[PDB]
C-alpha cells in the first residue's frame, strides 16, 4: 500500500517539476527575445546613429548610452525634438526667367514679403540663389509655382 501512496506522491512531484520546467522554457524564450532586442539596440543605438523611427527613443536619434542593471540593461537615448514651430507660406518652386527652380536641400518659405530657402528641420532663412537651387523644366509645368 505504501507503494501506491508513494507512486501518487511521485506523480505529483514529477508533474510539478514538468510544469516548472515548461514555464521556465517559455520565460527563457521571452528573455531570449528581449536579449536579442537589447543586443540589436546596443549595436544600432550605442555603436552608431540609427535612422529607425522610435527604435532608439522618441524624436530624431542622436546617440545612446548603456547602463547595466540587475538581470538587464538600461539605455539612455539622447534625441533631438523640434520645438517652437512657426507656420510659413511655401511653394514647390520659384519661377524666375521662365525656368523652374527647385531646392537642392531645404524648403522654400516666406514671411509674407520675401521668399527664402531654409533647412527643413530648423528655421534659418537663406537667400534663394543658383547655388542653393537647381533648374529643371519651366514655369508652365509645376503646379503652384510662384514668381
Amino acid at each position: 500500500e505504501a507503494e501506491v501512496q508513494i507512486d501518487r506522491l511521485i506523480t505529483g512531484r514529477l508533474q510539478s517539476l514538468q510544469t516548472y520546467v515548461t514555464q521556465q522554457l517559455i520565460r527563457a524564450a521571452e528573455i531570449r527575445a528581449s536579449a536579442n532586442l537589447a543586443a540589436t539596440k546596443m549595436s544600432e543605438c550605442v555603436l552608431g546613429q540609427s535612422k529607425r523611427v522610435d527604435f532608439c527613443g522618441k524624436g530624431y536619434h542622436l546617440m545612446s548610452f548603456p547602463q547595466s542593471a540587475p538581470h538587464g540593461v538600461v539605455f539612455l537615448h539622447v534625441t533631438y525634438v523640434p520645438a517652437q514651430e512657426k507656420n510659413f507660406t511655401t511653394a514647390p518652386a520659384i519661377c524666375h526667367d521662365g525656368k523652374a527652380h527647385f531646392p537642392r536641400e531645404g524648403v522654400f518659405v516666406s514671411n509674407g514679403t520675401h521668399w527664402f530657402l531654409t533647412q527643413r528641420n530648423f528655421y534659418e532663412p537663406q537667400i534663394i540663389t543658383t547655388d542653393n537651387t537647381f533648374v529643371s523644366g519651366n514655369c508652365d509645368v509645376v503646379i503652384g509655382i510662384v514668381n
Partner: peptide
C-alpha cells in the same frame, strides 16, 4: 501652401529598460 518650420529645439533623454538574463 502652409508649412510649419521649427525655430528652436529640445535635447531629450529617455530611458528604455530591457531584461537580458534571468
Amino acid at each position: 501652401n502652409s508649412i510649419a518650420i521649427p525655430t528652436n529645439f529640445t535635447i531629450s533623454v529617455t530611458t528604455e529598460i530591457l531584461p537580458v538574463s534571468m
